């Protein structure tokens, strides 16, 4: 729930940050956002130009809606586009227009059964058709300002759609203000906990949402905002940090290296573990992790055994190998992993004291409590100042269990088992020559 | 310093562009950017709406600051966030507010010792609390315009923060104008050369900077702008361009290929060489290269030997191999590498003359002086029109030194040594059968 803990494993040159809580996007909720349109001195010329801006944007969006919707072809906006193709049917936009008369928001059930939360964020019909057309003529300038303020959002929404080919992510305050999004969260069919979670992190909700331009028909401008559904909440999460583990023979080039490849975020999900290899897809609010299951791999509960016994036969833990013993560092949640090899100078420093630690050759770990920076040669690393408990788990480096002569130097996506039987066959290669003579 | 030179190596189907100068981001400098806030007819309704926009943005930012700061978890904004957590302490914002009374900028030493350059880019307190509140009432419209102009920056800064989850890069003119950034550069503790370098390339400084939303407390809106520190200046840089090198046996499929994998930018850094495999991370101002050391690999000075003797035993030069002899081209700083294999048509053309060169099978190189485009089958390549000297270094293609029968076809991240001993074992595999009979 809080109380971030972190364990570094001397044996595998890796660390695990535990104590986080999950918020996993497992589904999508489509909502329909609508703008109603009016079909139609220096005071008047300002109105002339501003009305030209209004209608130019409408025709611009009308050109954009011509059988457009698609992005990335990851089929992420597939759920939203499905609603869009339905909105293109005879009286479906009219249902939305009917419910939103003299209101800002409404629930509509399309003839497919899909209930959509609908919102009217701007009324240019009831402005142009009731205050602006009623007057080439004369006017007072503070109507020019008022028309510019209202028309601005339509122009800015057309701005985003044109440059993003009708689909935008993340969702801007132009597409949906905090007020409008918080209202939408309040009424979409989710747990009181899910509503609380989304409302406290609307910025993250924007990151994992889409705005899809749909249709301009019957004087309604409608676009679909595809909101995330977090169906997995409050389950344990943990992040795995990995760094190369090499031998430290004195002579340069005579060393063999090994690195765990399964780094990223892991979260419990219904008896299995969801793994997100691309830390891009996860957002962290200092004890809560929001991740998209689209880029997730569903793994057994036994994958955690790679943190306690990397040689267990129940799971085939993945590593890569090399014989390049370069010096590098990784910044974890509560500290830093420092892989110092060869002649390189590696240090940890406090901004007020200077160097308070010099690392020896090998893989080591320091916490962030009294350290500000870490230097590995020509690179300067800054540590996070998150608060937690840091643990060091003693153990023999597993790179010492391998014979350098039979060790597979180049393996990019191997594993403990695959490396072993690769070694077995190379041991058999020498062996059948060991009894001929 | 200038005078870009470029050498193409016939032996390894690669080229090196020398003569560039370095500007390497090795550290960060955190500065604090502040906005002071006021705590609180058709003329008045415009003020009403514009004041609603003002306070809605404040509450929007207040919702965003709730234990937020993090992005990417590369720990890039770690230094800036460390200042942010300090600004959350009892009288630390008050120190910033005290120094910035009746001024635009000031140096503040926080109680941690960290001296921060502080700037006040907008004063909405001394506007709302002195000209706007002094008047529901009456007014003259040119106060409506004036309030809209001042409030715009606050609204636009809230615009960026909401869609980027409180951390934005690159840094916009909304976060920090050229005037404000140039002033900040002038006073941050760097060499006169570093100040000159940053001030002539503020656009690049923006590319390698972060703006972090921090806190709204005690009527101050503060965000941290994390400016780059270029601790390595004016050292030689060079870019390596690589293209496949294949044999040219007549029969399709009977050929073996080879490609150097170490392409990217290289720069001298304190007795070693900094390598940036992701040319994304480097920005080039036609003889000056700005690179971030976060994505850098620190390599020995001997790595350059791969450009003069790819078979040297001092460095294990990296290659990948294949038996697919497809035709492809690479556009270098001063020309183009053309790998033409099989039946494909490869040409270089001048926009006024047409085809002035037809390439034969193999790897070749042409300069950009009198060539405008290069065609390799169905692809059209345009060459840069940078000026320099282009050199062709004769040499036997190293792919001809390999026997196709023992040649490892699929190696993705191999090296000269790893390929050799892979060949040795496969030669031993045939050999022990060569003396049984």
């Amino acid at each position: 729930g809080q109380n971030i803990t972190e364990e570094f494993y001397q044996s595998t040159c890796s660390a695990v940050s535990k104590g986080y809580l999950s918020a996993l996007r497992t589904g999508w909720y489509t909502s329909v956002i609508t703008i109603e349109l009016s079909n139609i001195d220096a005071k008047v010329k300002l109105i002339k130009q501003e009305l030209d801006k209004y209608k130019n944007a409408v025709t611009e969006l009308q050109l954009l809606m011509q059988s457009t919707p698609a992005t990335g072809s990851g089929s992420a906006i597939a759920s939203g586009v499905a609603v869009c193709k339905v909105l293109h049917l005879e009286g479906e936009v009219n249902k939305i227009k009917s419910a939103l008369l003299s209101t800002n928001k409404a629930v509509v059930s399309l003839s497919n059964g899909v209930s959509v939360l609908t919102f009217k964020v701007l009324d240019l019909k009831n402005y142009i058709d009731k205050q602006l057309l009623p007057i080439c003529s004369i006017s007072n300038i503070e109507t020019v300002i008022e028309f510019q303020q209202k028309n601005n959002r339509l122009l800015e929404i057309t701005r985003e759609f044109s440059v993003n080919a009708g689909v935008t992510t993340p969702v801007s305050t132009y597409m949906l203000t905090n007020s409008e999004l918080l209202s939408l969260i309040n009424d979409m069919p989710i747990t009181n906990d899910q509503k609380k979670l989304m409302s406290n992190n609307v910025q993250i909700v924007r990151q994992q949402s889409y705005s899809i331009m749909c249709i301009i028909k019957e004087e309604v401008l409608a676009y679909v905002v595809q909101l995330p559904l977090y169906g997995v909440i409050d389950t344990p999460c943990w992040k795995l940090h990995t760094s190369p583990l090499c031998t430290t023979n004195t002579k340069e080039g005579s060393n063999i290296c090994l690195t765990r490849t399964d780094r990223g975020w892991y979260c419990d999900n219904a008896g299995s573990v969801s793994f997100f290899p691309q830390a891009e897809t996860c957002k962290v609010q200092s004890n809560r992790v929001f991740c998209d299951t689209m880029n997730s791999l569903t793994l057994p509960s036994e994958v955690n055994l790679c943190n306690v016994d990397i040689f267990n036969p129940k799971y085939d833990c993945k590593i890569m190998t090399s014989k390049t013993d370069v010096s590098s560092s990784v910044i974890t949640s509560l500290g830093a992993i420092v892989s110092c090899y060869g002649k390189t100078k590696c240090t940890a420093s406090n901004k007020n004291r200077g160097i308070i630690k010099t690392f020896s050759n090998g893989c080591d770990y320091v916490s962030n409590k009294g350290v500000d920076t870490v230097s590995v040669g020509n690179t300067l690393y800054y540590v996070n100042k998150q608060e937690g408990k840091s643990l060091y788990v003693k153990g023999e480096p597993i790179i010492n269990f391998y014979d350098p002569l039979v060790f597979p130097s180049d393996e990019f996506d191997a594993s403990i088992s695959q490396v072993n039987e690769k070694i077995n066959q190379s041991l058999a290669f020498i062996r059948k020559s060991d009894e001929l003579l | 310093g200038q005078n870009i030179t470029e050498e193409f190596y016939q032996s390894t189907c690669s080229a090196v562009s020398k003569g560039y100068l370095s500007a390497l981001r090795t550290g960060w400098y955190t500065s604090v950017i502040t906005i002071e806030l006021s705590n609180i007819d058709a003329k008045v309704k415009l003020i009403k709406q514009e004041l609603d926009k003002y306070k809605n943005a404040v509450t929007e930012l207040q919702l965003l600051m709730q234990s937020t700061p993090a992005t990417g978890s590369g720990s890039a904004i770690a230094s800036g966030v460390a200042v942010c957590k300090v600004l959350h302490l009892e009288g630390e914002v008050n120190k910033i507010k005290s120094a910035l009374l009746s001024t635009n900028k000031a140096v503040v030493s926080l109680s941690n010792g960290v001296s921060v350059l502080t700037f006040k880019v907008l004063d909405l307190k001394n506007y709302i609390d002195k000209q706007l509140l002094p008047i529901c009432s009456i007014s003259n419209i040119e106060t409506v315009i004036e309030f809209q102009q001042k409030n715009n920056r606050l609204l636009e800064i809230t615009r960026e923060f909401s869609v980027n989850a409180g951390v934005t890069t690159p840094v916009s003119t909304y976060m920090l104008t050229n005037s404000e950034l140039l002033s900040l550069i002038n006073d941050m503790p760097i060499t006169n050369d570093q100040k000159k370098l940053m001030s002539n390339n503020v656009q690049i400084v923006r590319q390698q900077s972060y703006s972090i939303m921090c806190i709204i407390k005690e009527e101050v809106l503060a965000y941290v702008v994390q400016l780059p520190l270029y601790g390595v200046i004016d050292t030689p840089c060079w870019k390596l361009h690589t293209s496949p090198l294949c044999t040219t046996n007549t029969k399709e499929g009977s050929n073996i290929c080879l490609t150097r994998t170490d392409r990217g930018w290289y720069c001298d850094n304190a007795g070693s060489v900094s390598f940036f495999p992701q040319a994304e991370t480097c920005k080039v101002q036609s003889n000056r290269v700005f690179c971030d050391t976060m994505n850098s690999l620190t390599l020995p000075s001997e790595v350059n030997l791969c450009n003069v003797d790819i078979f040297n035993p001092k460095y294990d030069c990296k290659i990948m191999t294949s038996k697919t002899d497809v035709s492809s081209s690479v556009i270098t700083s001063l020309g183009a590498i053309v790998s033409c294999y099989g039946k494909t048509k490869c040409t270089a053309s001048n926009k006024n003359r047409g085809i002035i060169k037809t390439f034969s099978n193999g790897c070749d190189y042409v300069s950009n002086k009198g060539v405008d485009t290069v065609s390799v089958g169905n692809t059209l390549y345009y060459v840069n029109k940078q000026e320099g000297k282009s050199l062709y270094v004769k040499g036997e293609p190293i792919i001809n030194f390999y026997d196709p029968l023992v040649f490892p076809s699929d190696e993705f991240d191999a090296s000269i040594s790893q390929v050799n001993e892979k060949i040795n074992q496969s030669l031993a595999f045939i050999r022990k059968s060569d003396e049984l009979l």
């Epitope: 500290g335 940890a348 406090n350 007020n352 004291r353 308070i356 630690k357 080591d364 770990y365 320091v366 916490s367 409590k369 009294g370 350290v371 408990k389 840091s390 643990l391 060091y392 | 030493s109 926080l110 109680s111 941690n112 010792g113």
Partner: antibody, heavy 132, light 110 residues
Amino acid sequence: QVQLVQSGGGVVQPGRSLRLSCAASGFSFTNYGMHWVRQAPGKGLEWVAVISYDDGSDKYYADSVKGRFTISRDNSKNTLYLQMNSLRAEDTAVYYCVRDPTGDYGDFPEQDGYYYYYGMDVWGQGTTVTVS
Amino acid sequence: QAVLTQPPSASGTPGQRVTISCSGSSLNIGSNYVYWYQQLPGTAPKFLIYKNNQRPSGVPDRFSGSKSGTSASLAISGLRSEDEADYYCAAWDDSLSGVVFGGGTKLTVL
């Protein structure tokens, strides 16, 4: 039964040397840093030295004793030492042995990779040293 | 000369709150955590406050701590007779490389 028991008290000659001992019982001594703290007659507390956890890599002294005093630990004997050299009249004080929590605030100790000051939770009852 | 400055004496009647101040520099208190100790007469110091505001197990609620910029203070609410003791603040100092103590505060209970 967390317990620190000190021994080694007595009078000495200026310019001579003298050692102190505090034997830990009731907890895993290896996993915690340890402090030496004195209190001169009628004066306040003065921090003397600290030893890092398990291996003592990091070991810091005050300038009042720098270059003359030395700290060391025997994890097998669960016992802490203070090497006092070149004793002077100003060193005359009651000497205390203290465990540094090293993370254990009621849960478990941590391993930061360097010395960090978590406080001073378990104290010996003190021993008396007089230089005359 | 007691790198951390705190008042020499304090006095109080039962039920009162006494407040003991402790002022340092950017290099000791402004940068690091502050810890408080209580030393009854003839006894060893007792661990009282850690990380500027945390009670160790078995320390009553009426003791509270706080830190402000470069200075810290300890609030002994509901003053009781046995609270009569010397109170010391302490923190890690980065200008040196060791722990620094306050001057002590002889607190008398009436």
